[PDB]
Amino acid sequence: QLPPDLRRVHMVGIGGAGMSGIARILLDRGGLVSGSDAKESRGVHALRARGALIRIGHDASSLDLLPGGATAVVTTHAAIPKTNPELVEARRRGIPVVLRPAVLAKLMAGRTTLMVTGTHGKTTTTSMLIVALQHCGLDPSFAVGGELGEAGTNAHHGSGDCFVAEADESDGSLLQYTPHVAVITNIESDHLDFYGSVEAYVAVFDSFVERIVPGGALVVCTDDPGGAALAQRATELGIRVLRYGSVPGETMAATLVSWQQQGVGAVAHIRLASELGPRVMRLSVPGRHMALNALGALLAAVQIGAPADEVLDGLAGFEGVRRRFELVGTCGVGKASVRVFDDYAHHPTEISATLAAARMVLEQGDGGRCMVVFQPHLYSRTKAFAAEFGRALNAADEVFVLDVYGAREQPLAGVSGASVAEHVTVPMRYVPDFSAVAQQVAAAASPGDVIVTMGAGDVTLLGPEILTALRVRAN
Ligand SMILES: CC(=O)N[C@H]1[C@@H](OP(=O)(O)OP(=O)(O)OC[C@H]2O[C@@H](n3ccc(=O)[nH]c3=O)[C@H](O)[C@@H]2O)O[C@H](CO)[C@@H](O)[C@@H]1O
Numbered sequence: 001q002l003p004p005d006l007r008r009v010h011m012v013g014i015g016g017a018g019m020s021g022i023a024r025i026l027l028d029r030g031g032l033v034s035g036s037d038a039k040e041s042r043g044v045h046a047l048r049a050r051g052a053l054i055r056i057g058h059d060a061s062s063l064d065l066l067p068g069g070a071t072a073v074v075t076t077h078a079a080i081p082k083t084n085p086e087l088v089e090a091r092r093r094g095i096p097v098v099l100r101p102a103v104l105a106k107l108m109a110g111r112t113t114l115m116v117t118g119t120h121g122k123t124t125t126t127s128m129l130i131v132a133l134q135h136c137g138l139d140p141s142f143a144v145g146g147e148l149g150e151a152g153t154n155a156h157h158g159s160g161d162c163f164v165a166e167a168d169e170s171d172g173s174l175l176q177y178t179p180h181v182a183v184i185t186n187i188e189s190d191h192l193d194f195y196g197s198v199e200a201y202v203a204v205f206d207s208f209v210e211r212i213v214p215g216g217a218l219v220v221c222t223d224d225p226g227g228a229a230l231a232q233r234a235t236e237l238g239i240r241v242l243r244y245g246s247v248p249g250e251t252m253a254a255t256l257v258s259w260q261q262q263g264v265g266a267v268a269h270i271r272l273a274s275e276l277g278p279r280v281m282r283l284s285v286p287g288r289h290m291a292l293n294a295l296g297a298l299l300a301a302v303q304i305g306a307p308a309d310e311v312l313d314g315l316a317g318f319e320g321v322r323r324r325f326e327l328v329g330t331c332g333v334g335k336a337s338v339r340v341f342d343d344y345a346h347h348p349t350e351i352s353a354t355l356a357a358a359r360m361v362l363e364q365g366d367g368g369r370c371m372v373v374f375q376p377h378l379y380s381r382t383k384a385f386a387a388e389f390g391r392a393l394n395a396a397d398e399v400f401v402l403d404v405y406g407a408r409e410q411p412l413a414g415v416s417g418a419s420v421a422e423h424v425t426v427p428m429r430y431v432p433d434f435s436a437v438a439q440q441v442a443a444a445a446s447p448g449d450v451i452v453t454m455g456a457g458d459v460t461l462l463g464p465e466i467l468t469a470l471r472v473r474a475n
């Protein structure tokens with residue numbers, strides 16, 4: 001059953017992906033949901049079809065939709081408190097206002113919870129874990145999504161005792177949750193916008209590990225430096241630590257012995273601990289970082305008692321999450337054909353890994369160039385990590401640097417996309433005209449090339465565009 005406060009829930013910004021998933025879980029567990037949204041979308045249409053009362057635009061009257069007033073009001077992170085009319089009315093009536101993580105935590109209460117968190121790779125690892133659990137015939141509840149924006153976001157109310165969730169760390173949401181199994185992909189020095197320091201950002205993961213239930217497990221990647229530091233710290237605390245990575249050791253639970261990309265997909269020889277011989281793990285997604293994500297999902301799945309062999313079988317079916325090297329399309333056929341992929345990489349490590357995966361897919365292709373179209377994400381992040389972005393993009397045969405993506409951030413003087421292009425030693429261009437990109441990439445294309453659109457903003461739209469301009473060139 002639902003808690004008393006989650007009985008009648010009014011949601012400001014119910015069209016959002018995470019909010020839509022939360023609303024559907026509530027509606028499936030017997031609760032009444034009303035809501036409001038500034039912009040009409042098809043998700044609002046779906047929730048209306050599921051009996052939710054949604055008003056387009058915000059108003060105090062929305063709090064009179066549910067019978068007997070709303071027991072709670074959930075709000076999105078983009079809503080502004082003392083100015084949104086509905087939050088003002090809700091605080092004027094004494095109605096509680098909460099964020100999505102609090103409602104998610106209340107929804108995960110009685111179940112065995114498996115959180116996945118880290119600087120990046122959360123949605124991919126969470127999706128791998130969900131698919132592995134479902135391939136074993138389980139039907140867990142889940143709420144994946146957040147890191148890749150709205151890509152990969154999906155929630156579901158299952159009939160089982162498990163609850164998989166992606167837990168964001170850039171806003172202090174980790175402290176809202178109580179994991180039975182906590183997975184930590186990596187801890188990098190980024191997303192420090194909310195913490196003001198690096199020590200605070202690492203202390204948030206420390207406090208998250210403190211929140212694990214007694215008897216629970218911390219799956220963690222020890223190839224990442226911060227991840228290995230946290231593994232050691234949590235081992236001192238007498239907490240079950242399941243380490244996974246490439247470097248071997250006397251405390252490894254799952255060691256990546258070898259990895260090789262082939263045409264079908266990749267094959268990785270892995271080694272598991274005796275409590276959990278050398279096994280083979282075949283994957284359909286490209287890239288060596290996908291092997292580590294699969295190992296994390298595998299450890300998390302076996303901890304709750306799923307057989308590792310058929311969990312590997314399930315991981316072998318994973319075809320990927322949107323904007324995780326998602327194949328946009330192709331012009332031509334066989335060899336001498338140009339393929340267009342779309343990735344969400346906005347961290348220098350993400351960029352390097354995506355470009356390495358593209359290089360590996362291109363190498364055993366008997367000829368081709370790696371052309372990337374990078375769009376830096378934030379003004380502050382670009383002003384900070386411009387040299388990192390450029391040196392990362394150096395792993396491509398040609399670079400196209402778009403302009404900086406706003407993302408509601410205040411424009412900094414002297415900062416633009418060219419701030420990254422300064423540090424690009426490979427052949428590159430600067431194309432701030434977003435309309436002129438699709439043509440210039442297609443004109444610069446050549447048979448057998450691997451084109452990647454990379455960034456966390458508008459760039460995802462150029463994917464199909466580059467394809468069209470490529471088919472126009474078919475003369
Ligand atoms: C991951 C992502 O990119 N977006 C998520 C971000 O919200 P975030 O605050 O980014 O919300 P966005 O601006 O992206 O918009 C998401 C939804 O918010 C609605 N909206 C927004 C502003 C506003 O003043 N009024 C309003 O109703 C929009 O109509 C939209 O449907 O965290 C929310 C969780 O709390 C998620 O549910 C949102 O999907």
Ligand SMILES: [Zn+2]
Pocket residue numbers: 119120191346347
């Ligand atoms: Zn990020």
